[PDB]
Symmetry: C2
Subunit: 245 residues, 2 copies
């Protein structure tokens, strides 16, 4: 890294049976032949009913078709407030119960148009790019690429995120050390197939979907850091807690 249509009727009935537990995970879906006879449908209808359930990710192959066991999702807790002790891991996963570690690599770069725009600087202007692999008790479960404008951090003790007196303590603490007060954060959660490099690092198969948080920290209206934070969609959800006023 560094009158419903027949096939929907049939599919609907089996889907219910799947949600019931009537068809428990690792149990074979009724066969094509069985679906045809039991529901009195054509071969194509039985075939298309099965394709619905597969496109929906409810069943898979592994000589027959098996109800998939879908894991209970874990939350990646998102927060702007201060923790116990601040680290890049705790900054991404606010859940105090989770003990976590990271490896990172930092190197300068000229900002792409896209990153320049997220940081509100001229394209080609220099940034510090740091990549992280985060582990939860030895298990890799999150990736991140973070960009910071050298206009802000250049020639300061916090220029390198994982070095110096506040290295390893995250963006808000590192910024505060140079009299820059982060006061807002925007986070946009999207989903897409993982990049090979991401999926290989995260241990998923090609085509596996990841959640991608585009995150930008602000100090007095100016962007001071932007990042793409990546977690496997099959295992995780991105959790927010908001006030209602």
């Amino acid at each position: 890294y560094f009158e419903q249509p027949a096939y929907l009727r049939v599919a609907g009935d089996l889907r219910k049976k799947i949600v019931d537990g009537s068809l428990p995970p690792h149990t074979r879906l009724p066969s094509q032949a069985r679906i045809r006879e039991e529901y009195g449908v054509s071969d194509t209808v039985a075939l298309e009913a099965r394709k619905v359930l597969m496109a929906e990710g409810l069943v898979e192959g592994r000589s027959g078709t098996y109800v998939r066991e879908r894991p209970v999702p874990r939350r990646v807790a998102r927060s702007g407030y201060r923790p116990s002790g601040a680290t890049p891991f705790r900054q991404e996963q606010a859940d105090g119960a989770v003990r976590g570690t990271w490896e990172s690599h930092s190197e300068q770069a000229e900002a792409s148009g896209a990153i320049a725009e997220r940081l509100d600087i001229r394209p080609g202007e220099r940034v510090m790019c740091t990549k992280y692999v985060f582990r939860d008790a030895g298990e890799v479960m999150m990736l991140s690429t973070s960009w910071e404008p050298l206009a802000v951090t250049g020639r300061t003790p916090v220029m390198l995120p994982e070095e110096g007196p506040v290295g390893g303590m995250g963006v808000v603490e590192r910024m505060a050390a140079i009299d820059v007060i982060v006061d807002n954060v925007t986070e946009e959660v999207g989903a897409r197939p993982g990049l090979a490099e991401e999926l290989l690092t995260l241990g998923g198969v090609p085509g596996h979907v990841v959640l991608v948080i585009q995150r930008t920290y602000f100090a007095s209206g100016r962007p001071v850091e932007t990042a793409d934070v990546v977690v496997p969609a099959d295992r995780y959800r991105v959790a927010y807690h908001l006030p209602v006023k």
Copy 2:
């Protein structure tokens, strides 16, 4: 609804060319034969390089392979604060610039284990289930299923979300009308293939991924509403704005 491996090296080079614009959307990816000759690789290596880019969703077929045009994503703005005027649409899409409409259908039900748990009531206890289809200027772009405990709304003027004196004004306003003050909201964003019924309503193809927000409104520690809010991952991102303290 109601030393990198060869194929990664090659794939990496073409991916860069794709990000460059060197290979613009709707332009054919170099052919298998061209990749073999230009990069001096085996047929299988050229083949596997192409599969990386397809699993990554960067290229597609449509007699050759074409660089996909990936649309600029739109934000679904998430917020707990009060808007102009409150509606179920504005409750889901805080972005004031977006003019939107909905159709809904409400009917009682016994709470499933899963919904019972999200609402902190006994399974089988009755709820009002309301389904929404939301449109942005005539275009369907969001689905939702909302459950409310009849323990809270039963025998009140806000029992039916889209009827009565505060019907069509959303959960926080409807709850306030019955002296129930919603003070917190939790939102967990996940991703999964859409259900046929969802994708058919949203206009996607089978297997298309949706973002699913599991949302629960709280009043004084008690859940008063829970919902699954659904948007197409290819077109939308879920946007949050958080304070940093």
